Design an enzyme around this catalytic site. Structure first.
Site, short mmCIF file in Angstrom:
data_model
loop_
_atom_site.label_atom_id
_atom_site.label_comp_id
_atom_site.label_asym_id
_atom_site.label_seq_id
_atom_site.Cartn_x
_atom_site.Cartn_y
_atom_site.Cartn_z
N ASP A 35 0.86 -1.19 0.00
CA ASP A 35 0.00 0.00 0.00
C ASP A 35 0.89 1.24 0.00
O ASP A 35 1.35 1.67 1.09
CB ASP A 35 -0.91 -0.01 1.22
CG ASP A 35 -1.85 1.17 1.26
OD1 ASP A 35 -1.92 1.88 0.25
OD2 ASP A 35 -2.46 1.36 2.33
N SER A 199 -0.71 15.73 -11.87
CA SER A 199 -0.94 15.39 -13.26
C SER A 199 -1.21 16.66 -14.08
O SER A 199 -1.76 17.61 -13.54
CB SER A 199 -2.14 14.42 -13.37
OG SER A 199 -2.51 14.19 -14.67
#
Ligand code: NA
EC number: 3.4.23.22
Length: 330
Positions: A35, A199
């Site tokens: 994770d 992004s």
């Protein structure tokens, strides 16, 4: 040193991925969920409340000659999905894919929430976010990556998740055979303890690319792609009959649909998520309503590039002094 381990989807939907991890002496092999959005290595154990164990493999510290109680240490964690676990702490030898760390904090669960009990395939979690998020008290502990780092050939690990197929976690090296083209690196903020990046925008299907900054985290422990409501509405508007369902808890679409791809920007580069990756199947067994893999992050307070996005790429988690992320097509 390096390590290389295969990661395998737990079910036919890629709901999560498990990777075998050796703990203790002699080795006890548990299948953990790696994770990158959390920083605790915790396991089902001989200490876990018996009614909360249903098929998981358990760590038994009393059977390990290298286990030592970390006296006074406790831990308690709550995840984004509402699940939780807590317990006490041992140090022991932990190996992943041939890479060994001695004195790793292994957080032994005394209590786990119902979603963990109900998932017989996940024996615990191995956190790979920054060690500033580790929940051990009163002495915070390091992740497996942070303890391994100095020994590795390069201070990196890579995630290469498969679509309906096994993939790989590598530690300490880039496998230049595992991706196409070049790796595009992007800046990371560690201020919230995550692999947080920005992004450069998105496209839906064959549509034009929209240049827009989207701050979010690279999180292998999250199944889906969580993005701002504007972006998610633009995606599902291209699917006839898709809608946001308050009753189901997100966007659903007709199981008869062919889904468009979703592209996200990494600097001037582009990662294309095929439409098929965005199908999470019927909402309930036999339903013709299917659950979408792109969902709104509104109310979660962060965007999450979870497995739907990461499994479309070869992802480099660069833990150099100034961390960075790298993405490649594959
Ligand atoms: Na679900």
């Amino acid at each position: 040193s390096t390590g290389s381990a295969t990661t395998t989807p737990i079910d036919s939907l890629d709901d999560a991925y498990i990777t075998p991890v050796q703990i203790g002496t002699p080795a006890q092999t548990l299948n953990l969920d790696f994770d990158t959005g959390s920083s605790d290595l915790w396991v089902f154990s001989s200490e876990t409340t018996a009614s909360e164990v249903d098929g998981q493999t358990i760590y038994t510290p009393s059977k390990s000659t290298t286990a030592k109680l970390l006296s006074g240490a406790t831990w308690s964690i709550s995840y984004g999905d509402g699940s939780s676990s807590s317990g006490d702490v041992y140090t022991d030898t932990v190996s992943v894919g041939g890479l060994t760390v001695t004195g790793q904090a292994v957080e032994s669960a005394k209590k786990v929430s119902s979603s963990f009990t109900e998932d017989s395939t996940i024996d615990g979690l191995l956190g790979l976010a920054f060690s500033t998020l580790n929940t051990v008290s009163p002495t915070q502990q390091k992740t497996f990556f942070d303890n391994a780092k100095a020994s590795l050939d390069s201070p990196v690990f890579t995630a290469d998740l498969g679509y309906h197929a096994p993939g790989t976690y590598n530690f300490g090296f880039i496998d230049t055979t595992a991706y196409t083209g070049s790796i595009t690196y992007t800046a990371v903020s560690t201020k919230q303890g995550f692999w947080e990046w920005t992004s450069t925008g998105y496209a839906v299907g064959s549509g034009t690319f929209k240049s827009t900054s989207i701050d979010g985290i690279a999180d292998t422990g999250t199944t889906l792609l969580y993005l701002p409501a504007t972006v998610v509405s633009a995606y599902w508007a291209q699917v006839s009959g898709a809608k946001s369902s308050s009753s189901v808890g997100g966007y659903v679409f007709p199981c008869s649909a062919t889904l468009p791809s979703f592209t996200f920007g990494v600097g001037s580069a582009r990662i294309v998520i095929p439409g098929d990756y965005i199908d999470f199947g019927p909402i309930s067994t036999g339903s013709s309503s299917c659950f979408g893999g792109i969902q709104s992050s509104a109310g979660i307070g962060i965007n999450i590039f979870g497995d739907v996005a990461l499994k479309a790429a070869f992802v480099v988690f660069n833990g150099a002094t100034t961390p960075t992320l790298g993405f490649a097509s594959k």
